[PDB]
């Protein structure tokens, strides 16, 4: 059998890999091992902008 699938297997597989990615970890503002908050000294509103 000589079957060429449309959409292609390779093209679909590449796209699904990107969607497989779990979201990043937003640990800013939380304490640390010794109890100090993790992050940089930037204003609360200016950080969002």
């Amino acid at each position: 059998e000589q079957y060429k699938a449309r959409p292609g297997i390779a093209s679909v597989q590449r796209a699904t890999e990107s969607a497989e990615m779990p979201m990043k970890n937003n640990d800013e503002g939380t304490p640390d091992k010794k109890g100090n908050t993790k992050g940089d000294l930037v204003n609360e509103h200016s950080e969002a902008k």
Binding site: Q2, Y3, K4, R6
Partner: protein, 49 residues
Amino acid sequence: FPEAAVSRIVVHTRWASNVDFDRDSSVIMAPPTENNIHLFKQLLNTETL
């Protein structure tokens, strides 16, 4: 008529003609012992590998 063990009928537009101007759109088939699949895949068989 041909003198043979088996005879068959085939369609061949203008197989015996003497025209002055050619319309240049003809239908020719081979004898049934040869493949004729190319006549049925001219319109939308753009994905047939």
